[PDB]
Amino acid sequence: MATSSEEVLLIVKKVRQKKQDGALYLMAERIAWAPEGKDRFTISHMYADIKCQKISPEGKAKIQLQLVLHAGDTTNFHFSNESTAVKERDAVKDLLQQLLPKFKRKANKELEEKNRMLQEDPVLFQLYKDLVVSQVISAEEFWANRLNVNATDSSSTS
């Protein structure tokens, strides 16, 4: 069956994400953040999905952590816990960086360029939902003429 080894490895608190501070819990196989007062992780990424981690420059009153997922995503966190914020992001950066290679999945650059194109060109992503979502054509059909040319002028067409 699906063995969910939910092993909380680190307990981090006072982390503002999505304009709401909470608690970020690390697990053997993933990272999950919950808002303060809620037992619900509104953020849960598997190390296999997280490519790397970025942290804000030290000596600042803003402990910010930013993970980047292989799909071409990310995970930004604001450790507002002035008491251990820095150390929390540190042990976090370290712990994740420990389990991250443990679950290091293949870098899907094929997907990265796709995701990044959908973020850059709002029209491209619009037509994507228009055609590919309406089952008008497959995703690669649209991508075929877009991956080779990323320009909103051309994105106005298939």
Question: Can you describe what's shown?
Answer:
It is a single chain. A hairpin with a 7-residue loop joins strand 5 and strand 6 (63-69). The longest helix has 15 residues, at 85-99. It is built from 5 helices and 7 strands; from the N terminus they run E-E-E-E-E-E-E-H-H-H-H-H. It has a domain at 8-103: PH-domain like. The protein has helices at 85-99, 109-120, 122-132, 139-147, 152-155, and strands at 8-17, 20-27, 30-35, 43-46, 50-55, 63-69, 73-79. Helix 2 (109-120) crosses helix 3 (122-132) and helix 3 (122-132) packs antiparallel against helix 4 (139-147). The chain is an alpha+beta fold and 158 residues long. The chain is 32% helix and 30% strand. The PDB classes it as nuclear protein. Keywords: DNA repair factor, general transcription factor, nucleotide excision repair, nuclear protein. It forms a monomeric assembly. The entry is titled "Solution structure of the tandem PH and BSD1 domains of TFIIH p62".
